[PDB]
Amino acid sequence: VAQLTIGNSTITTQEAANIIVGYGEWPSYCSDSDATAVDKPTRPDVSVNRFYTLDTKLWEKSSKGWYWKFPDVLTETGVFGQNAQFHYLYRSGFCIHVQCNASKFHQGALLVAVLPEYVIGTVAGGTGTEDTHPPYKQTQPGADGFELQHPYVLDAGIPISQLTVCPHQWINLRTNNCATIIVPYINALPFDSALNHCNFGLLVVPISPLDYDQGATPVIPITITLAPMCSEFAGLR
Amino acid sequence: GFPTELKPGTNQFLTTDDGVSAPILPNFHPTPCIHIPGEVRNLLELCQVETILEVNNVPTNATSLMERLRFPVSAQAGKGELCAVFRADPGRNGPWQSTLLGQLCGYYTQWSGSLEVTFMFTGSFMATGKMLIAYTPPGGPLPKDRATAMLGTHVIWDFGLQSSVTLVIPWISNTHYRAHARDGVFDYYTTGLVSIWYQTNYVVPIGAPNTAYIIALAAAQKNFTMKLCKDASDILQTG
Amino acid sequence: GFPTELKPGTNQFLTTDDGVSAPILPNFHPTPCIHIPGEVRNLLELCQVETILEVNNVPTNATSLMERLRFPVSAQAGKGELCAVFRADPGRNGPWQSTLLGQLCGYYTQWSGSLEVTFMFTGSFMATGKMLIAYTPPGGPLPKDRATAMLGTHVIWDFGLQSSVTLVIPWISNTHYRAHARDGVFDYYTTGLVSIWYQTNYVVPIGAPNTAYIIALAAAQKNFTMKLCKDASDILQTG
Amino acid sequence: HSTAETTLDSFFSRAGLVGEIDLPLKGTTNPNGYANWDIDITGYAQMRRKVELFTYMRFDAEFTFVACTPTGEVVPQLLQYMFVPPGAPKPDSRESLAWQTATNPSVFVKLSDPPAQVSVPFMSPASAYQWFYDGYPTKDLEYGAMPNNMMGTFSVRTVGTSKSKYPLVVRIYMRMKHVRAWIPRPMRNQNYLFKANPNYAGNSIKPTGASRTAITTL
Amino acid sequence: HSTAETTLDSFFSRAGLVGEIDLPLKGTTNPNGYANWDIDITGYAQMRRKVELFTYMRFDAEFTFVACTPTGEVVPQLLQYMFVPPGAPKPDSRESLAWQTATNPSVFVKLSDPPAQVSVPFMSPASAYQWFYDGYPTKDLEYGAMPNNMMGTFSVRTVGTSKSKYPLVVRIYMRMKHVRAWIPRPMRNQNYLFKANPNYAGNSIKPTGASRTAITTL
C-alpha cells in the first residue's frame, strides 16, 4: 500500500494490482503532420490532468448496474470541463480506477469494462412500434452516471454475457476490490467534439449480486476516481 | 487480331468469383486510413476470448435473465450431490449460445479444437469447501455418482484456496454429418460432458451468506479452427 | 485462338473511362505547339491569386455595382463602432462569390486550406487612425464590442503607417455534410468570422476628404486543396 | 491446420443481394420508369448483425447488376445505371438533367449483355465507416447518426425518351472487398426494430439462447 | 495532401453530351434521313464558361456515339458516321458523293454493336485554339472570329439506298484529353446571349454574387 499524487489530488490506493491497458495501446499525443498543424493544439499538464473522484455510487442487492459517458462525465466537472466546453476539438486518454470498500463478509462480482461508441437504445414503446429516441439524461448522464434497466442486453440489444470482449476487469469481493483501466483515444478521426460525441462509456455491473447477513453494512460504496492522459484541445471560444 | 476460343462459363455471374471490376471513380483518392486501436484480423482471435457461459440457462422470466449468468452453491447441498452439468457443444443450443464462441460457430459449418472453461467463485471470502469437476469424454455417460466421477478425468476445486480454476476440454469435433428430417446438419455427437459435484459441503462462519454463485467463462485454445462459411440467423434486418 | 472469358462491364460505356480509342486521322501531323506565355497547369495556381473581395455586397442598383468592390470609413464613425463584418466561406454565397477563388470552389464539392485577406486603404495620404481587425474562429459568435473582439485574435491596423495589411485565416474546411430540403449539400459550419472595428476615429487635416474606401483582396495559401469535380452553373450556353 | 476461412475478408466476401428495383408498366410502383436506390448494405438481411460485430470498418464494394422481366426473361432493351456520389443531386424525374451530369458516373448495357459490374471506393470523409455513433451532429432524433457513412445513390432507368415496352426488374448484388475492422463488440442477441437505431422490444426481451428445465438435466 | 483533381486534365476529362441528332420517319426535322453536325464543344452547356477561363487551349477529343430509337430501343439497323475534316465539303443530300470520298473518314456500326468511338486530333492550323480574337480576318460582323478553330463536321445517316424503317436518335459525347491552357481570364459573371460573341444584356447587369442588407449584418 502507498499513495500517489498528481498536483493537489492525493489518493490512497493499493501498490499495483493488474492494470488493463485497453487494446494494448497507451494514450499518446498526436504529431505535427496532422489535419490542423497551424492551430497548434495546446496540451494541458498543470491542473487539467489530475485525480477526479466522482460521487460514490452505493451498491445494493437490487442494483442493476451503472454507466457513465466520456468525455461527458467531465465536461461538467472542474477545469477540465472548462477546456472541453470552450474549445473546438478534443482527444484524450484515460486512467480509470474503481474501488469498493467491503468487509470480508460481503460477496459480489462486478464486471467493469469500457465500450466505444456506447449507443443507448430504449424499450421503443414496449410492443416494438414506437420509434422513441433515448433522452439527453440517458445519453449523457454526467458525473452521477445512470442505471441500466435491462442489464442482460445492456440497454442496447447486446448480450452482456459477451461484454468481456471489451477492455474489462473483474472485481470479485473475495479477492480484490480495486480495478484499473488505461484507455487510449479511440475514434475514426484524430480529433472531435467533446460535447457532441462520447467516444466511449464506462460500464460497471453486478454479475454476482451483493449479499450479506443482516447486520453488516447493506450498501457497498463504489468509488470511481479517474485521470486524463495526454489530453489535447484546439480552437478556443 | 489475336486468335481466341471462348470456353464454357463465359458470361456467367458467380456470386463467389473474386475477379476485378472497373473502378467507378478513377480519380478519387479515398480519405487515408489512420491508426485505430484494436484492429481484428482473423475471427479466431475472438474465439480465444473468455465470454460468460450461461450454464444456468433455465430462467426465462424477463427480469431473471441476469440469473442465467451465474449458478449457485449452498449449505443445503449435501456432500456428493450433483451441483450442475452441461455438454461441450459450442455450436449447439444451450449454454454455449451465450458465449461469443458459440455465436461465431453459427456462421460456420465445421470446427475443432481444445476448449477451456474457467470457473469463478463469487461467494463471501469467509466460505470454503471443495467441488469436484469432472469431464466425461464423448460417449461416456454422465457418471452415476461423485465417486464414479472421481475415477474419471476430474479436478478437486477448493475455493477456500483459489477463487478461480480453469478446465481444459482436450477436444471437440463437429465433423460427423447427419441427415435427419430432410434437412442435413453437420452435428456433434462429441457431446463431451462436464459434471460438477459437491465434494464437501459449503462451510461458513456466522455472519456470512449461506449461498454464493459461480461464473462460467469459456473460450477456445489457439488450436481452434472453423470451416465452411454459413450465414444463418434468427435476427435479421426488419422491413 | 487464345482462350478468353468476357467479364461483366463488357460493352459498357463509362463516361469517365479514360481508355484509348482509334485515331480518325492516322497520318495527320497536327501543327506543333509553340511557346506561349503564362501556361496554367493546375487550378490551385489560380486560387493563390489575389482577387477583389466584394465585402460591400449590398448595392444592386446597376450603376452602383462598382461600389461593391470597396467599403468606406469616415470621420462620422465613432471609436469602437463596428465598421464591417463577413465570414470565411469561400464557396458559399456572399462576398466570396466575387473572388476568383470563390468561383473555382463552385466546380468542386470539398476543400480546405488557410486563406488570406489583404486590406488596402485608398484614402487621402494625410489621413491616419487605427482599425481593429479580429477573427472569431468557427463557432465563436461575433464579438459583442470592440473590447471583447480585442481579446480575440486581432490586429491593430494603423493606416497612418502602413497602407496595406494582410490577415491570414488559419483554416476553413467545407467537409461537414448536410442533407436539408431533400438536396444534399456538403456545407461549411466553419463560418469563421472577420470583424472590423474603428479602434480610433478617422482623423484628417483641413483639405482632405472625410471619407475613404478600402479594398479587400483574398486568395488561399499554398496549402489549399479541392476535391470532387462538380460542374454547376447558372450561366450556360443559350439555345 | 489452415485458418484462411476465419479471416475478415473470407467472412465478408461473396456478392450478396442488397437491392431490387421494380419497373412495371402499369403500376403504383415507380410510375416514371426510373428509380433511385440509396446504397444500403443492410439490404442483405444477414448482413447487419455480421458487420455490427465491429465498431469501425473500411472496404470497397463490387456491384453486379442483374436485370430481366418478372419471369426472368431477357429482352432487347437498353438501360442506364447512374451512380450519384454523396453530395450529388439525385434525379427527381425521368428527364432530370442529373442523368446527363458527367460527374455522375453512368454505365449503359443491354439486357442481353451479361451483368454490369463496377467497383466503388471507400467514400466516407472519415477514416472509417462506423456502425455506432454515441452523439449528435453539431432527447433528440439525430442520435446515433454518422452521416459520413453514405456511399451514394444508384439511379436506374430505361434508356430513351419514352417508357420502356417491357416490365423490368433489376437486382443489385454487392461483394465487399479489402476489409479492415476495429473494436469488436457483443453480438446482437435481440431482434432489430429499426434500420437506424439499436432499439429493441422491452417486453419481448428473450434469452440469448435455448433454455432448459434444470441445471442438472441435459 | 494530393492535388491531382485540381489539374487541367482532371478538370476537363469526362465525356459530356455535346450533340443529339434526330432522324424521325415522318417529320419536319432532317427529312432526308441524314444530318450534318459541325463540331461544337459548347454543346455541353456547362462547358463554355469552363473553357472561357483561358485565352488559349489545345487538346484531343474522344467521341463516343450512342444511337437508339426515341424510347431508347435497339434495332437491326446499320449506320454511317462520316467525319468531314475542315475544308472538306459536307453532303448536301442523302446521295452526295461526299459520302464515298475516302478522304472523309467514315465508320460503320450496327445499333446492336456497342458505342462507336474515335479520337480526333488538334486540327487548328494555329498553335492553339483561341477562345478570344480581338480583331477581324483580312463596326463589322467578322469581329472575334477565329475560324482556324474549326474541328470539322460529323455527318450521320442510315446506311442503304432507302430511308430507314425506324425513327432514330444519335447522341454524341466528347471527352477532352491531353489539355494545355494559357493566359487565364475573369470568369464570365453575366449571362451568355450568343454563341459567337461575349455580348451581354446591358439592362440586366447583375452583381456577380448574392447581395445582403448591410455590411454589418450576416
Side-chain angles (χ1 to χ4, degrees), chain A, chain B residues 1-59 61-239, chain C residues 1-59 61-239, chain D, chain E:
Chain A
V1 55
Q3 52 179 53
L4 34 165
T5 314
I6 306 180
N8 59 304
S9 49
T10 307
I11 61 155
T12 56
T13 193
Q14 298 177 299
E15 294 160 63
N18 305 70
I19 55 169
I20 302 303
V21 178
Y23 300 133
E25 285 174 50
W26 274 77
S28 46
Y29 285 113
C30 207
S31 53
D32 280 295
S33 54
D34 199 63
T36 292
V38 212
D39 193 300
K40 330 240 299 181
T42 42
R43 307 158 177 172
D45 267 291
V46 278
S47 69
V48 189
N49 292 346
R50 44 151 253 173
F51 291 145
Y52 296 87
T53 310
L54 330 199
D55 262 307
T56 298
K57 291 307 149 189
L58 302 168
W59 188 349
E60 289 186 57
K61 291 199 171 185
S62 61
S63 303
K64 316 218 80 308
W66 301 267
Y67 73 69
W68 291 264
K69 291 297 181 69
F70 286 66
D72 158 68
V73 56
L74 281 172
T75 51
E76 203 61 82
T77 312
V79 77
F80 179 80
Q82 190 59 46
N83 298 296
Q85 294 201 306
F86 305 77
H87 265 73
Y88 182 42
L89 293 174
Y90 144 104
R91 86 185 308 296
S92 182
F94 279 103
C95 177
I96 315 178
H97 188 58
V98 182
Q99 341 134 59
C100 312
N101 312 75
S103 72
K104 304 177 184 174
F105 293 76
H106 290 69
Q107 33 176 290
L110 300 186
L111 175 48
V112 194
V114 181
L115 171 36
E117 309 297 1
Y118 183 14
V119 184
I120 302 298
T122 22
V123 172
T127 48
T129 49
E130 266 76 81
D131 210 47
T132 54
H133 301 287
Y136 179 72
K137 300 74 178 59
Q138 205 171 301
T139 289
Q140 276 137 50
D144 288 309
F146 189 102
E147 291 195 69
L148 297 169
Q149 315 185 57
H150 296 142
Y152 188 47
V153 300
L154 303 184
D155 295 3
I158 40 189
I160 180 177
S161 58
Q162 296 167 44
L163 176 51
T164 58
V165 66
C166 294
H168 73 285
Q169 180 111 77
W170 286 94
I171 291 176
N172 190 339
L173 287 187
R174 69 167 283 127
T175 50
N176 66 286
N177 73 298
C178 78
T180 291
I181 292 180
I182 293 304
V183 184
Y185 181 67
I186 298 178
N187 194 51
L189 306 172
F191 283 77
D192 201 3
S193 176
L195 314 89
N196 286 168
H197 182 191
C198 286
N199 312 96
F200 74 83
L202 166 60
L203 231 52
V204 29
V205 179
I207 305 310
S208 181
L210 172 57
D211 207 354
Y212 49 89
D213 276 358
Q214 267 292 297
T217 298
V219 296
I220 297 316
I222 303 178
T223 333
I224 283 57
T225 307
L226 49 82
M229 302 182 70
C230 295
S231 60
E232 302 183 64
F233 300 97
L236 182 61
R237 302 172 294 178
Chain B
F2 174 61
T4 303
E5 296 192 3
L6 289 192
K7 300 296 179 183
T10 300
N11 301 299
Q12 67 170 30
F13 175 32
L14 219 203
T15 60
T16 70
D17 199 59
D18 78 311
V20 79
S21 33
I24 195 67
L25 272 16
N27 298 304
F28 189 55
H29 268 61
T31 93
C33 40
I34 74 180
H35 189 70
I36 305 304
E39 176 185 359
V40 177
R41 285 202 163 69
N42 186 301
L43 291 167
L44 271 161
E45 302 178 14
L46 303 174
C47 298
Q48 297 174 181
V49 180
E50 301 253 51
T51 10
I52 300 182
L53 207 197
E54 295 180 21
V55 172
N56 176 43
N57 65 317
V58 290
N61 150 52
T63 49
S64 298
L65 292 174
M66 273 281 87
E67 297 186 1
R68 321 189 94 224
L69 313 183
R70 76 284 185 294
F71 54 73
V73 305
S74 74
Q76 290 80 305
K79 60 190 191 73
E81 273 189 54
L82 173 68
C83 176
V85 65
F86 66 96
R87 29 192 41 131
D89 58 336
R92 285 168 37 185
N93 297 185
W96 294 84
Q97 290 177 290
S98 73
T99 58
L100 175 61
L101 184 82
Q103 289 308 313
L104 294 171
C105 290
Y107 286 92
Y108 281 86
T109 301
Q110 286 173 48
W111 61 73
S112 73
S114 301
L115 296 180
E116 161 205 297
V117 185
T118 312
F119 302 99
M120 194 174 296
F121 183 75
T122 73
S124 169
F125 162 80
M126 294 305 308
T128 177
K130 289 190 176 59
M131 295 302 286
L132 189 161
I133 298 153
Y135 174 59
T136 333
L142 180 162
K144 46 191 287 185
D145 52 59
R146 179 206 118 279
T148 50
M150 188 286 279
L151 301 151
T153 303
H154 69 303
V155 180
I156 269 59
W157 183 33
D158 185 297
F159 47 102
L161 306 202
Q162 47 191 308
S163 291
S164 279
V165 67
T166 304
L167 173 49
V168 161
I169 303 307
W171 196 270
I172 65 95
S173 200
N174 162 290
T175 49
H176 213 298
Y177 188 25
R178 177 205 256 87
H180 58 291
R182 200 172 183 70
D183 180 55
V185 301
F186 257 112
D187 200 51
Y188 275 87
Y189 86 86
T190 77
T191 39
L193 291 187
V194 184
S195 42
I196 288 170
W197 323 62
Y198 283 88
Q199 172 56 50
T200 66
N201 59 298
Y202 186 69
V203 182
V204 108
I206 318 179
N210 316 284
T211 297
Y213 297 76
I214 306 166
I215 306 170
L217 298 182
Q221 238 81 73
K222 304 195 178 183
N223 70 306
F224 203 68
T225 38
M226 311 196 106
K227 265 167 54 176
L228 262 205
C229 274
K230 187 183 95 293
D231 288 5
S233 190
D234 334 303
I235 325 175
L236 293 71
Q237 178 62 290
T238 51
Chain C
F2 174 61
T4 303
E5 296 192 3
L6 289 192
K7 300 296 179 183
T10 300
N11 301 299
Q12 67 170 30
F13 175 32
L14 219 203
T15 60
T16 70
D17 199 59
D18 78 311
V20 79
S21 33
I24 195 67
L25 272 16
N27 298 304
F28 189 55
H29 268 62
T31 93
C33 40
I34 74 180
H35 189 70
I36 305 304
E39 176 185 359
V40 177
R41 285 202 163 69
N42 186 301
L43 291 167
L44 271 161
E45 302 178 14
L46 303 174
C47 298
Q48 297 174 181
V49 180
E50 301 253 51
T51 10
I52 300 182
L53 207 197
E54 295 180 21
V55 172
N56 176 43
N57 65 317
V58 290
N61 150 52
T63 49
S64 298
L65 292 174
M66 273 281 87
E67 297 186 1
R68 321 189 94 224
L69 313 183
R70 76 284 185 294
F71 54 73
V73 305
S74 74
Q76 290 80 305
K79 60 190 191 73
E81 273 189 54
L82 173 68
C83 176
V85 65
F86 66 96
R87 29 192 41 131
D89 58 336
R92 285 168 37 185
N93 297 185
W96 294 84
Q97 290 177 290
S98 73
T99 58
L100 175 61
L101 184 82
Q103 289 308 313
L104 294 171
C105 290
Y107 286 92
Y108 281 86
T109 301
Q110 286 173 48
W111 61 73
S112 73
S114 301
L115 296 180
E116 161 205 297
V117 185
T118 312
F119 302 99
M120 194 174 296
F121 183 75
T122 73
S124 169
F125 162 80
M126 294 305 308
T128 177
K130 289 190 176 59
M131 295 302 286
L132 189 161
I133 298 153
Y135 174 59
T136 333
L142 180 162
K144 46 191 287 185
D145 52 59
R146 179 206 118 279
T148 50
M150 188 286 279
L151 301 151
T153 303
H154 69 303
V155 180
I156 269 59
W157 183 33
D158 185 297
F159 46 102
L161 306 202
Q162 47 191 308
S163 291
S164 279
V165 67
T166 304
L167 173 49
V168 161
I169 303 307
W171 196 270
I172 65 95
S173 200
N174 162 290
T175 49
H176 213 298
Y177 188 25
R178 177 205 256 87
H180 58 291
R182 200 172 183 70
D183 180 55
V185 301
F186 257 112
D187 200 51
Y188 275 87
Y189 86 86
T190 77
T191 39
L193 291 187
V194 184
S195 42
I196 288 170
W197 323 62
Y198 283 88
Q199 172 56 50
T200 66
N201 59 298
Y202 186 69
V203 182
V204 108
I206 318 179
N210 316 284
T211 297
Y213 297 76
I214 306 166
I215 306 170
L217 298 182
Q221 238 81 73
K222 304 195 178 183
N223 70 306
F224 203 68
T225 38
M226 311 196 106
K227 265 167 54 176
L228 262 205
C229 274
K230 187 183 95 293
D231 288 5
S233 190
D234 334 303
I235 325 175
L236 293 71
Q237 178 62 290
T238 51
Chain D
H1 62 60
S2 174
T3 61
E5 260 192 285
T6 35
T7 73
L8 257 46
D9 278 296
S10 164
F11 188 59
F12 290 106
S13 62
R14 304 185 277 296
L17 178 50
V18 285
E20 189 181 301
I21 315 299
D22 264 72
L23 297 177
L25 309 164
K26 318 297 190 311
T28 148
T29 144
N30 293 306
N32 312 67
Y34 86 100
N36 288 163
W37 181 68
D38 294 55
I39 301 177
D40 172 7
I41 76 176
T42 212
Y44 171 10
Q46 304 277 50
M47 195 64 83
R48 180 158 180 172
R49 195 190 185 225
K50 277 171 62 176
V51 292
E52 268 180 52
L53 171 76
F54 301 97
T55 311
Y56 306 108
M57 263 180 75
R58 207 164 184 287
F59 57 63
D60 298 310
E62 184 170 271
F63 287 117
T64 321
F65 295 74
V66 179
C68 53
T69 73
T71 50
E73 222 187 330
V74 195
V75 292
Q77 181 71 47
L78 186 56
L79 309 176
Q80 195 206 319
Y81 301 133
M82 170 167 262
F83 170 85
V84 320
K90 319 174 193 64
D92 50 56
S93 65
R94 195 167 187 296
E95 46 281 297
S96 176
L97 283 65
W99 294 116
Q100 284 124 293
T101 307
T103 67
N104 283 314
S106 298
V107 22
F108 304 66
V109 49
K110 315 178 190 64
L111 238 67
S112 43
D113 291 323
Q117 186 176 71
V118 305
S119 291
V120 183
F122 172 76
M123 303 306 274
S124 182
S127 190
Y129 293 108
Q130 66 174 71
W131 308 154
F132 304 76
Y133 185 69
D134 185 353
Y136 316 98
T138 310
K139 202 290 186 183
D140 208 9
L141 319 168
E142 309 284 10
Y143 186 55
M146 163 55 158
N148 324 72
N149 268 183
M150 172 76 276
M151 271 144 264
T153 308
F154 263 121
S155 294
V156 181
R157 53 158 303 174
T158 88
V159 167
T161 74
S162 306
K163 228 81 163 185
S164 177
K165 298 176 58 183
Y166 324 70
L168 299 173
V169 184
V170 155
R171 286 196 179 62
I172 307 155
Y173 292 59
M174 171 194 108
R175 194 192 82 209
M176 270 189 251
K177 54 182 187 178
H178 304 148
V179 187
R180 260 158 77 72
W182 296 265
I183 323 302
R185 62 201 309 155
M187 286 275 277
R188 180 77 177 198
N189 79 316
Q190 297 300 310
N191 269 90
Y192 288 111
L193 301 184
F194 316 104
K195 300 213 166 193
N197 57 60
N199 283 36
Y200 51 81
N203 294 37
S204 322
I205 296 180
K206 312 296 181 180
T208 298
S211 298
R212 57 163 161 171
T213 311
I215 188 161
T216 52
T217 57
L218 351 72
Chain E
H1 62 60
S2 174
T3 61
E5 260 192 285
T6 35
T7 73
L8 257 46
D9 278 296
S10 164
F11 188 59
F12 290 106
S13 62
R14 304 185 277 296
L17 178 50
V18 285
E20 189 181 301
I21 315 299
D22 264 72
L23 297 177
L25 309 164
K26 318 297 190 311
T28 148
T29 144
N30 293 306
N32 312 67
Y34 86 100
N36 288 163
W37 181 68
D38 294 55
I39 301 177
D40 172 7
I41 76 176
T42 212
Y44 171 10
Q46 304 277 50
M47 195 64 83
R48 180 158 180 172
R49 195 190 185 225
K50 277 171 62 176
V51 292
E52 268 180 52
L53 171 76
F54 301 97
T55 311
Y56 306 108
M57 263 180 75
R58 207 164 184 287
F59 57 63
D60 298 310
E62 184 170 271
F63 287 117
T64 321
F65 295 74
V66 179
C68 53
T69 73
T71 50
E73 222 187 330
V74 195
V75 292
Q77 181 71 47
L78 186 56
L79 309 176
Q80 195 206 319
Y81 301 133
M82 170 167 262
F83 170 85
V84 320
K90 319 174 193 64
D92 50 56
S93 65
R94 195 167 187 296
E95 46 281 297
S96 176
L97 283 65
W99 294 116
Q100 284 124 293
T101 307
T103 67
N104 283 314
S106 297
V107 22
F108 304 66
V109 49
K110 315 178 190 64
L111 238 67
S112 43
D113 291 323
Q117 186 176 71
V118 305
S119 291
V120 183
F122 172 76
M123 303 306 274
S124 182
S127 190
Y129 293 108
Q130 66 174 71
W131 308 154
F132 304 76
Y133 185 69
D134 185 353
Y136 316 98
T138 310
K139 202 290 186 183
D140 208 9
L141 319 168
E142 309 284 10
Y143 186 55
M146 163 55 158
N148 324 72
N149 268 183
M150 172 76 276
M151 271 144 264
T153 308
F154 263 121
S155 294
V156 181
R157 53 158 303 174
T158 88
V159 167
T161 74
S162 306
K163 228 81 163 185
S164 177
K165 298 176 58 183
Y166 324 70
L168 299 173
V169 184
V170 155
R171 286 196 179 62
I172 307 155
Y173 292 59
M174 171 194 108
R175 194 192 82 209
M176 270 189 251
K177 54 182 187 178
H178 304 148
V179 187
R180 260 158 77 72
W182 296 265
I183 323 302
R185 62 201 309 155
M187 286 275 277
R188 180 77 177 198
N189 79 316
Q190 297 300 310
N191 269 90
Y192 288 111
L193 301 184
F194 316 104
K195 300 213 166 193
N197 57 60
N199 283 36
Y200 51 81
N203 294 37
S204 322
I205 295 180
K206 312 296 181 180
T208 298
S211 298
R212 57 163 161 171
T213 311
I215 188 161
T216 52
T217 58
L218 351 72

